[PDB]
Symmetry: D2
Protein backbone atom coordinates (compact mmCIF):
# COMPACT_ATOMS: atom_id res chain seq x y z
CA UNK A 1 0.00 0.00 0.00
CA UNK A 2 3.07 2.37 0.25
CA UNK A 3 2.73 2.72 -3.57
CA UNK A 4 -1.13 2.84 -3.24
CA UNK A 5 -1.17 5.76 -0.75
CA UNK A 6 1.81 7.83 -2.05
CA UNK A 7 0.72 10.64 -4.42
CA UNK A 8 -1.89 13.38 -4.92
CA UNK A 9 -5.46 12.96 -3.59
CA UNK A 10 -8.55 15.19 -3.95
CA UNK A 11 -11.67 15.36 -1.71
CA UNK A 12 -15.33 16.26 -2.49
CA UNK A 13 -14.62 19.95 -1.54
CA UNK A 14 -11.76 20.22 -4.12
CA UNK A 15 -9.02 20.15 -1.42
CA UNK A 16 -5.62 18.62 -2.40
CA UNK A 17 -3.76 16.14 -0.13
CA UNK A 18 -0.19 15.45 -1.35
CA UNK A 19 1.33 12.59 0.69
CA UNK A 20 4.36 10.29 0.84
CA UNK A 21 4.00 6.92 2.66
CA UNK A 22 7.31 5.76 4.24
CA UNK A 23 8.28 2.05 4.69
CA UNK A 24 8.31 2.78 8.51
CA UNK A 25 4.55 3.73 8.62
CA UNK A 26 5.13 7.52 8.24
CA UNK A 27 2.87 9.97 6.30
CA UNK A 28 4.45 13.34 5.26
CA UNK A 29 3.15 15.95 2.82
CA UNK A 30 1.05 19.08 2.36
CA UNK A 31 -2.68 19.90 2.47
CA UNK A 32 -4.42 22.66 0.51
CA UNK A 33 -7.99 23.39 1.71
CA UNK A 34 -10.55 24.68 -0.85
CA UNK A 35 -12.67 26.04 2.12
CA UNK A 36 -12.37 27.90 5.44
CA UNK A 37 -9.61 30.16 6.84
CA UNK A 38 -6.87 28.68 4.63
CA UNK A 39 -4.65 29.59 1.70
CA UNK A 40 -1.87 27.68 -0.09
CA UNK A 41 -0.16 24.56 1.42
CA UNK A 42 0.11 23.47 5.11
CA UNK A 43 2.46 20.83 6.53
CA UNK A 44 0.88 17.48 7.37
CA UNK A 45 2.24 14.47 9.20
CA UNK A 46 0.59 11.18 10.08
CA UNK A 47 0.82 7.37 10.33
CA UNK A 48 -0.58 4.31 8.50
CA UNK A 49 -0.70 0.52 9.08
CA UNK A 50 2.33 -0.66 6.99
CA UNK A 51 1.32 -4.38 7.39
CA UNK A 52 -2.47 -4.41 6.85
CA UNK A 53 -4.71 -7.53 6.89
CA UNK A 54 -4.78 -9.77 3.73
CA UNK A 55 -8.60 -10.48 4.08
CA UNK A 56 -9.74 -7.57 1.80
CA UNK A 57 -9.88 -5.07 4.77
CA UNK A 58 -8.79 -1.45 4.19
CA UNK A 59 -5.58 0.08 5.66
CA UNK A 60 -6.05 2.34 8.73
CA UNK A 61 -4.34 5.71 8.64
CA UNK A 62 -4.58 9.24 9.93
CA UNK A 63 -2.88 12.62 9.72
CA UNK A 64 -2.90 16.14 11.20
CA UNK A 65 -2.78 19.69 9.79
CA UNK A 66 -2.19 22.72 12.07
CA UNK A 67 -3.68 25.65 10.11
CA UNK A 68 -0.61 27.90 10.33
CA UNK A 69 1.71 28.65 7.39
CA UNK A 70 3.63 31.73 6.08
CA UNK A 71 0.29 33.37 4.95
CA UNK A 72 -2.34 32.71 7.65
CA UNK A 73 -2.87 31.31 11.17
CA UNK A 74 -6.41 29.96 11.82
CA UNK A 75 -5.40 28.86 15.42
CA UNK A 76 -6.80 25.39 14.69
CA UNK A 77 -5.83 21.81 13.76
CA UNK A 78 -7.68 19.09 11.87
CA UNK A 79 -7.09 15.36 12.26
CA UNK A 80 -8.31 12.87 9.61
CA UNK A 81 -8.88 9.23 10.71
CA UNK A 82 -9.82 6.71 8.05
CA UNK A 83 -8.87 3.85 5.82
CA UNK A 84 -7.31 3.49 2.36
CA UNK A 85 -9.21 1.10 -0.02
CA UNK A 86 -7.16 -0.04 -3.08
CA UNK A 87 -8.45 -0.86 -6.61
CA UNK A 88 -9.44 0.74 -9.94
CA UNK A 89 -11.36 3.50 -8.04
CA UNK A 90 -9.00 3.80 -4.99
CA UNK A 91 -10.41 5.84 -2.09
CA UNK A 92 -9.35 7.16 1.32
CA UNK A 93 -12.57 7.32 3.45
CA UNK A 94 -12.12 9.61 6.49
CA UNK A 95 -13.85 11.28 9.38
CA UNK A 96 -12.22 14.40 10.83
CA UNK A 97 -12.05 16.55 13.95
CA UNK A 98 -11.24 20.28 13.59
CA UNK A 99 -10.31 21.88 16.99
CA UNK A 100 -9.86 25.66 17.51
CA UNK A 101 -7.94 27.28 20.35
CA UNK A 102 -10.68 28.77 22.61
CA UNK A 103 -11.14 30.37 26.03
CA UNK A 104 -12.36 27.93 28.77
CA UNK A 105 -15.84 29.62 28.42
CA UNK A 106 -16.11 28.68 24.65
CA UNK A 107 -14.36 25.24 24.88
CA UNK A 108 -17.74 23.41 24.65
CA UNK A 109 -17.90 24.70 20.97
CA UNK A 110 -14.15 24.12 20.12
CA UNK A 111 -14.51 21.07 17.82
CA UNK A 112 -16.16 20.45 14.44
CA UNK A 113 -16.73 16.92 13.06
CA UNK A 114 -17.11 15.90 9.44
CA UNK A 115 -16.25 13.39 6.72
CA UNK A 116 -14.03 13.62 3.60
CA UNK A 117 -13.68 11.05 0.78
CA UNK A 118 -10.39 11.35 -1.20
CA UNK A 119 -9.91 9.99 -4.74
CA UNK A 120 -6.94 10.01 -7.19
CA UNK A 121 -9.03 12.03 -9.78
CA UNK A 122 -10.96 15.40 -9.39
Amino acid sequence: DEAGITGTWYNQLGSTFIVTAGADGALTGTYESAVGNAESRYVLTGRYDSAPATDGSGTALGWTVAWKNNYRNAHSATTWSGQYVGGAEARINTQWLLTSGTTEANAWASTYVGHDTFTKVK
Copy 2:
Protein backbone atom coordinates in the same frame (compact mmCIF):
# COMPACT_ATOMS: atom_id res chain seq x y z
CA ASP B 1 4.03 26.68 24.21
CA GLU B 2 7.00 24.55 22.85
CA ALA B 3 8.27 24.32 26.50
CA GLY B 4 4.73 23.74 27.90
CA ILE B 5 3.81 20.84 25.52
CA THR B 6 7.16 18.95 25.43
CA GLY B 7 7.30 16.18 28.06
CA THR B 8 5.38 13.24 29.51
CA TRP B 9 1.55 13.35 29.73
CA TYR B 10 -1.02 10.96 31.29
CA ASN B 11 -4.76 10.55 30.50
CA GLN B 12 -7.77 9.37 32.58
CA LEU B 13 -7.18 5.70 31.40
CA GLY B 14 -3.54 5.54 32.59
CA SER B 15 -2.12 5.89 29.00
CA THR B 16 1.30 7.66 28.61
CA PHE B 17 1.90 10.30 25.84
CA ILE B 18 5.63 11.25 25.48
CA VAL B 19 5.93 14.21 23.05
CA THR B 20 8.50 16.70 21.76
CA ALA B 21 7.19 19.99 20.31
CA GLY B 22 9.42 21.39 17.49
CA ALA B 23 9.93 25.13 16.85
CA ASP B 24 8.54 24.35 13.31
CA GLY B 25 5.11 23.12 14.70
CA ALA B 26 6.03 19.37 14.71
CA LEU B 27 4.92 16.80 17.36
CA THR B 28 7.02 13.60 17.61
CA GLY B 29 7.19 10.84 20.25
CA THR B 30 5.55 7.67 21.60
CA TYR B 31 2.16 6.59 22.96
CA GLU B 32 1.54 3.71 25.34
CA SER B 33 -2.13 2.75 25.75
CA ALA B 34 -3.35 1.29 29.06
CA VAL B 35 -6.41 -0.23 27.18
CA GLY B 36 -7.37 -2.17 24.02
CA ASN B 37 -5.25 -4.19 21.57
CA ALA B 38 -1.94 -2.55 22.51
CA GLU B 39 1.33 -3.27 24.26
CA SER B 40 4.44 -1.15 24.85
CA ARG B 41 5.10 2.11 22.90
CA TYR B 42 3.82 3.17 19.41
CA VAL B 43 5.26 5.95 17.22
CA LEU B 44 3.23 9.16 17.05
CA THR B 45 3.52 12.26 14.87
CA GLY B 46 1.41 15.39 14.82
CA ARG B 47 1.27 19.21 14.53
CA TYR B 48 0.55 22.18 16.83
CA ASP B 49 -0.07 25.93 16.32
CA SER B 50 3.44 27.32 17.13
CA ALA B 51 2.06 30.97 17.26
CA PRO B 52 -1.20 30.79 19.29
CA ALA B 53 -3.48 33.78 20.05
CA THR B 54 -2.45 35.96 23.08
CA ASP B 55 -6.16 36.46 24.16
CA GLY B 56 -5.90 33.55 26.72
CA SER B 57 -7.18 30.90 24.23
CA GLY B 58 -5.68 27.39 24.15
CA THR B 59 -3.18 26.09 21.54
CA ALA B 60 -4.68 23.77 18.85
CA LEU B 61 -2.86 20.50 18.19
CA GLY B 62 -3.39 16.98 16.96
CA TRP B 63 -1.50 13.72 16.49
CA THR B 64 -1.86 10.17 15.14
CA VAL B 65 -0.89 6.65 16.31
CA ALA B 66 -1.10 3.65 13.93
CA TRP B 67 -1.48 0.61 16.24
CA LYS B 68 1.43 -1.38 14.84
CA ASN B 69 4.82 -1.94 16.52
CA ASN B 70 7.25 -4.86 16.90
CA TYR B 71 4.81 -6.71 19.28
CA ARG B 72 1.29 -6.32 17.82
CA ASN B 73 -0.75 -4.96 14.90
CA ALA B 74 -4.36 -3.87 15.71
CA HIS B 75 -4.98 -2.77 12.05
CA SER B 76 -6.18 0.61 13.36
CA ALA B 77 -5.13 4.25 13.85
CA THR B 78 -6.30 6.89 16.37
CA THR B 79 -6.11 10.65 15.76
CA TRP B 80 -6.40 13.06 18.72
CA SER B 81 -7.58 16.66 18.03
CA GLY B 82 -7.49 19.14 20.90
CA GLN B 83 -6.03 22.11 22.65
CA TYR B 84 -3.23 22.61 25.16
CA VAL B 85 -4.18 24.91 28.12
CA GLY B 86 -1.17 26.18 30.20
CA GLY B 87 -0.77 27.12 33.90
CA ALA B 88 -0.17 25.19 37.14
CA GLU B 89 -2.82 22.49 36.28
CA ALA B 90 -1.83 22.35 32.54
CA ARG B 91 -4.04 20.11 30.40
CA ILE B 92 -4.40 18.78 26.86
CA ASN B 93 -8.17 18.39 26.20
CA THR B 94 -8.82 16.10 23.19
CA GLN B 95 -11.43 14.28 21.20
CA TRP B 96 -10.28 11.26 19.19
CA LEU B 97 -11.29 9.06 16.26
CA LEU B 98 -10.13 5.40 16.15
CA THR B 99 -10.55 3.85 12.67
CA SER B 100 -10.09 0.11 12.03
CA GLY B 101 -9.34 -1.35 8.60
CA THR B 102 -12.63 -3.13 7.60
CA THR B 103 -14.32 -4.79 4.64
CA GLU B 104 -16.83 -2.52 2.79
CA ALA B 105 -19.78 -4.44 4.39
CA ASN B 106 -18.46 -3.48 7.89
CA ALA B 107 -17.22 0.09 6.99
CA TRP B 108 -20.29 1.69 8.65
CA ALA B 109 -18.90 0.44 12.05
CA SER B 110 -15.18 1.28 11.36
CA THR B 111 -14.75 4.31 13.65
CA TYR B 112 -15.02 4.91 17.41
CA VAL B 113 -15.17 8.41 18.93
CA GLY B 114 -14.13 9.43 22.43
CA HIS B 115 -12.45 12.08 24.59
CA ASP B 116 -9.16 12.02 26.56
CA THR B 117 -7.86 14.63 29.08
CA PHE B 118 -4.05 14.61 29.57
CA THR B 119 -2.27 16.10 32.62
CA LYS B 120 1.44 16.26 33.64
CA VAL B 121 0.80 14.25 36.89
CA LYS B 122 -0.43 10.59 37.34
Copy 3:
Protein backbone atom coordinates in the same frame (compact mmCIF):
# COMPACT_ATOMS: atom_id res chain seq x y z
CA ASP C 1 -40.62 21.73 5.67
CA GLU C 2 -43.26 19.76 7.71
CA ALA C 3 -44.58 18.57 4.28
CA GLY C 4 -40.97 18.12 2.94
CA ILE C 5 -39.68 16.00 5.90
CA THR C 6 -42.75 13.74 6.38
CA GLY C 7 -42.56 10.43 4.45
CA THR C 8 -40.23 7.51 3.67
CA TRP C 9 -36.44 8.07 3.38
CA TYR C 10 -33.62 5.66 2.33
CA ASN C 11 -29.88 5.88 3.16
CA GLN C 12 -26.74 4.63 1.32
CA LEU C 13 -26.82 1.30 3.27
CA GLY C 14 -30.44 0.45 2.26
CA SER C 15 -31.93 1.46 5.69
CA THR C 16 -35.53 2.81 5.78
CA PHE C 17 -36.48 5.89 7.85
CA ILE C 18 -40.27 6.47 8.09
CA VAL C 19 -41.02 9.83 9.76
CA THR C 20 -43.88 12.26 10.48
CA ALA C 21 -42.96 15.91 11.21
CA GLY C 22 -45.44 17.62 13.62
CA ALA C 23 -46.31 21.34 13.38
CA ASP C 24 -44.92 21.46 17.03
CA GLY C 25 -41.36 20.41 15.86
CA ALA C 26 -41.85 16.70 16.83
CA LEU C 27 -40.44 13.77 14.70
CA THR C 28 -42.11 10.34 15.14
CA GLY C 29 -41.78 7.15 13.18
CA THR C 30 -39.84 3.93 12.60
CA TYR C 31 -36.31 2.92 11.53
CA GLU C 32 -35.35 -0.31 9.74
CA SER C 33 -31.56 -0.86 9.54
CA ALA C 34 -30.10 -2.85 6.60
CA VAL C 35 -26.95 -3.59 8.75
CA GLY C 36 -25.85 -4.57 12.29
CA ASN C 37 -27.72 -6.28 15.17
CA ALA C 38 -31.21 -5.32 14.00
CA GLU C 39 -34.32 -6.74 12.37
CA SER C 40 -37.66 -5.21 11.41
CA ARG C 41 -38.79 -1.74 12.62
CA TYR C 42 -37.65 0.24 15.75
CA VAL C 43 -39.41 3.24 17.29
CA LEU C 44 -37.82 6.60 16.67
CA THR C 45 -38.48 10.07 18.12
CA GLY C 46 -36.77 13.38 17.50
CA ARG C 47 -37.09 17.14 16.90
CA TYR C 48 -36.70 19.57 13.96
CA ASP C 49 -36.51 23.39 13.58
CA SER C 50 -40.16 24.19 12.54
CA ALA C 51 -39.25 27.84 11.64
CA PRO C 52 -36.00 27.57 9.65
CA ALA C 53 -34.03 30.53 8.21
CA THR C 54 -35.32 31.77 4.76
CA ASP C 55 -31.70 32.53 3.48
CA GLY C 56 -31.50 29.10 1.67
CA SER C 57 -30.02 27.34 4.78
CA GLY C 58 -31.01 23.71 5.56
CA THR C 59 -33.41 22.75 8.41
CA ALA C 60 -31.67 21.30 11.54
CA LEU C 61 -33.13 18.06 12.93
CA GLY C 62 -32.21 14.94 14.83
CA TRP C 63 -33.66 11.72 16.13
CA THR C 64 -32.90 8.66 18.30
CA VAL C 65 -33.42 4.90 17.94
CA ALA C 66 -32.89 2.51 20.86
CA TRP C 67 -32.11 -0.90 19.27
CA LYS C 68 -34.80 -2.84 21.18
CA ASN C 69 -38.01 -4.19 19.68
CA ASN C 70 -40.07 -7.41 20.05
CA TYR C 71 -37.37 -9.44 18.11
CA ARG C 72 -33.92 -8.26 19.29
CA ASN C 73 -32.18 -6.03 21.85
CA ALA C 74 -28.72 -4.77 20.76
CA HIS C 75 -28.29 -2.84 24.12
CA SER C 76 -27.47 0.28 22.09
CA ALA C 77 -28.88 3.57 20.79
CA THR C 78 -28.10 5.68 17.69
CA THR C 79 -28.66 9.45 17.44
CA TRP C 80 -28.70 11.18 14.02
CA SER C 81 -27.91 14.95 13.92
CA GLY C 82 -28.27 16.66 10.55
CA GLN C 83 -30.05 19.00 8.21
CA TYR C 84 -32.89 18.60 5.71
CA VAL C 85 -32.11 20.24 2.32
CA GLY C 86 -35.27 20.61 0.13
CA GLY C 87 -35.73 20.74 -3.71
CA ALA C 88 -35.76 18.30 -6.68
CA GLU C 89 -33.16 15.96 -5.11
CA ALA C 90 -34.20 16.45 -1.42
CA ARG C 91 -31.72 15.11 1.15
CA ILE C 92 -31.21 14.66 4.88
CA ASN C 93 -27.44 14.87 5.52
CA THR C 94 -26.57 13.42 8.94
CA GLN C 95 -23.77 12.41 11.27
CA TRP C 96 -24.60 9.79 13.93
CA LEU C 97 -23.38 8.47 17.29
CA LEU C 98 -24.07 4.79 18.24
CA THR C 99 -23.51 4.11 21.99
CA SER C 100 -23.57 0.58 23.44
CA GLY C 101 -24.23 -0.15 27.13
CA THR C 102 -20.74 -1.26 28.42
CA THR C 103 -18.88 -2.00 31.66
CA GLU C 104 -16.76 0.93 33.06
CA ALA C 105 -13.63 -0.95 31.80
CA ASN C 106 -14.91 -0.97 28.13
CA ALA C 107 -16.58 2.51 28.17
CA TRP C 108 -13.65 4.09 26.17
CA ALA C 109 -14.90 1.92 23.22
CA SER C 110 -18.69 2.50 23.82
CA THR C 111 -19.38 4.87 20.88
CA TYR C 112 -19.26 4.60 17.04
CA VAL C 113 -19.42 7.67 14.74
CA GLY C 114 -20.56 7.75 11.15
CA HIS C 115 -22.52 9.59 8.52
CA ASP C 116 -25.73 8.77 6.65
CA THR C 117 -27.25 10.56 3.63
CA PHE C 118 -31.01 9.95 3.16
CA THR C 119 -32.92 10.49 -0.11
CA LYS C 120 -36.61 9.98 -1.08
CA VAL C 121 -35.60 7.32 -3.73
CA LYS C 122 -33.43 4.10 -3.45
Copy 4:
Protein backbone atom coordinates in the same frame (compact mmCIF):
# COMPACT_ATOMS: atom_id res chain seq x y z
CA ASP D 1 -33.79 1.89 35.13
CA GLU D 2 -37.09 3.80 34.49
CA ALA D 3 -36.87 5.14 38.14
CA GLY D 4 -33.06 5.63 37.90
CA ILE D 5 -33.25 7.82 34.72
CA THR D 6 -36.47 9.83 35.54
CA GLY D 7 -35.80 13.18 37.30
CA THR D 8 -33.54 16.22 37.11
CA TRP D 9 -29.92 15.96 35.85
CA TYR D 10 -27.08 18.55 35.64
CA ASN D 11 -23.95 18.61 33.39
CA GLN D 12 -20.43 20.11 33.86
CA LEU D 13 -21.63 23.38 32.16
CA GLY D 14 -24.51 23.85 34.66
CA SER D 15 -27.19 22.87 32.05
CA THR D 16 -30.43 21.24 33.41
CA PHE D 17 -31.92 18.06 31.83
CA ILE D 18 -35.45 17.23 33.14
CA VAL D 19 -36.57 13.80 31.83
CA THR D 20 -39.28 11.19 32.29
CA ALA D 21 -38.42 7.59 31.24
CA GLY D 22 -41.54 5.70 29.94
CA ALA D 23 -42.07 1.92 30.48
CA ASP D 24 -42.16 1.79 26.59
CA GLY D 25 -38.56 3.17 26.29
CA ALA D 26 -39.67 6.80 25.63
CA LEU D 27 -37.71 9.80 27.01
CA THR D 28 -39.59 13.13 27.26
CA GLY D 29 -38.70 16.35 29.05
CA THR D 30 -37.06 19.75 28.86
CA TYR D 31 -33.46 20.99 28.40
CA GLU D 32 -32.06 24.30 29.69
CA SER D 33 -28.58 25.16 28.34
CA ALA D 34 -26.24 27.27 30.53
CA VAL D 35 -24.24 28.17 27.31
CA GLY D 36 -24.74 29.17 23.62
CA ASN D 37 -27.71 30.73 21.74
CA ALA D 38 -30.37 29.53 24.22
CA GLU D 39 -32.59 30.76 27.02
CA SER D 40 -35.17 29.00 29.15
CA ARG D 41 -36.44 25.46 28.46
CA TYR D 42 -36.54 23.51 25.13
CA VAL D 43 -38.57 20.37 24.33
CA LEU D 44 -36.64 17.14 24.20
CA THR D 45 -37.57 13.62 23.19
CA GLY D 46 -35.54 10.45 22.99
CA ARG D 47 -35.29 6.68 23.63
CA TYR D 48 -33.57 4.32 26.12
CA ASP D 49 -32.97 0.54 26.33
CA SER D 50 -35.85 -0.45 28.74
CA ALA D 51 -34.39 -4.05 29.09
CA PRO D 52 -30.63 -3.54 29.59
CA ALA D 53 -28.06 -6.35 30.14
CA THR D 54 -27.87 -7.65 33.79
CA ASP D 55 -23.99 -8.05 33.59
CA GLY D 56 -23.04 -4.61 35.10
CA SER D 57 -23.23 -2.78 31.68
CA GLY D 58 -24.67 0.74 31.38
CA THR D 59 -28.10 1.48 29.79
CA ALA D 60 -27.91 2.97 26.23
CA LEU D 61 -30.02 6.10 25.54
CA GLY D 62 -30.18 9.22 23.45
CA TRP D 63 -32.25 12.36 22.98
CA THR D 64 -32.65 15.42 20.76
CA VAL D 65 -33.23 19.15 21.36
CA ALA D 66 -34.15 21.51 18.47
CA TRP D 67 -32.99 24.97 19.67
CA LYS D 68 -36.31 26.73 18.99
CA ASN D 69 -38.77 27.83 21.72
CA ASN D 70 -41.03 30.87 22.37
CA TYR D 71 -37.95 33.12 23.03
CA ARG D 72 -35.24 32.21 20.48
CA ASN D 73 -34.44 30.07 17.42
CA ALA D 74 -30.75 29.10 16.98
CA HIS D 75 -31.58 27.10 13.77
CA SER D 76 -29.77 24.09 15.26
CA ALA D 77 -30.38 20.68 16.93
CA THR D 78 -28.24 18.70 19.41
CA THR D 79 -28.37 14.90 19.82
CA TRP D 80 -26.82 13.28 22.95
CA SER D 81 -25.81 9.56 22.65
CA GLY D 82 -24.78 7.86 25.86
CA GLN D 83 -25.27 5.46 28.71
CA TYR D 84 -26.87 5.67 32.18
CA VAL D 85 -24.65 4.15 34.90
CA GLY D 86 -26.68 3.40 38.10
CA GLY D 87 -25.62 3.66 41.80
CA ALA D 88 -24.75 6.12 44.61
CA GLU D 89 -22.91 8.45 42.13
CA ALA D 90 -25.37 7.82 39.21
CA ARG D 91 -24.22 9.29 35.86
CA ILE D 92 -25.30 9.72 32.25
CA ASN D 93 -22.07 9.77 30.18
CA THR D 94 -22.75 11.27 26.73
CA GLN D 95 -21.23 12.40 23.46
CA TRP D 96 -23.19 14.92 21.42
CA LEU D 97 -23.55 16.31 17.88
CA LEU D 98 -24.84 19.90 17.35
CA THR D 99 -25.87 20.56 13.71
CA SER D 100 -26.79 24.08 12.46
CA GLY D 101 -28.88 24.75 9.33
CA THR D 102 -26.28 25.99 6.74
CA THR D 103 -25.97 26.83 3.04
CA GLU D 104 -24.34 24.03 0.98
CA ALA D 105 -21.08 26.09 0.78
CA ASN D 106 -20.85 26.12 4.65
CA ALA D 107 -22.14 22.54 5.20
CA TRP D 108 -18.59 21.18 5.88
CA ALA D 109 -18.64 23.36 9.09
CA SER D 110 -22.26 22.52 10.13
CA THR D 111 -21.52 20.10 13.03
CA TYR D 112 -19.91 20.44 16.50
CA VAL D 113 -19.01 17.38 18.57
CA GLY D 114 -18.46 17.26 22.35
CA HIS D 115 -19.11 15.35 25.55
CA ASP D 116 -21.36 16.00 28.57
CA THR D 117 -21.44 14.14 31.93
CA PHE D 118 -24.79 14.46 33.85
CA THR D 119 -25.12 13.89 37.61
CA LYS D 120 -28.14 14.06 40.02
CA VAL D 121 -26.43 16.81 42.14
CA LYS D 122 -25.27 20.37 41.10
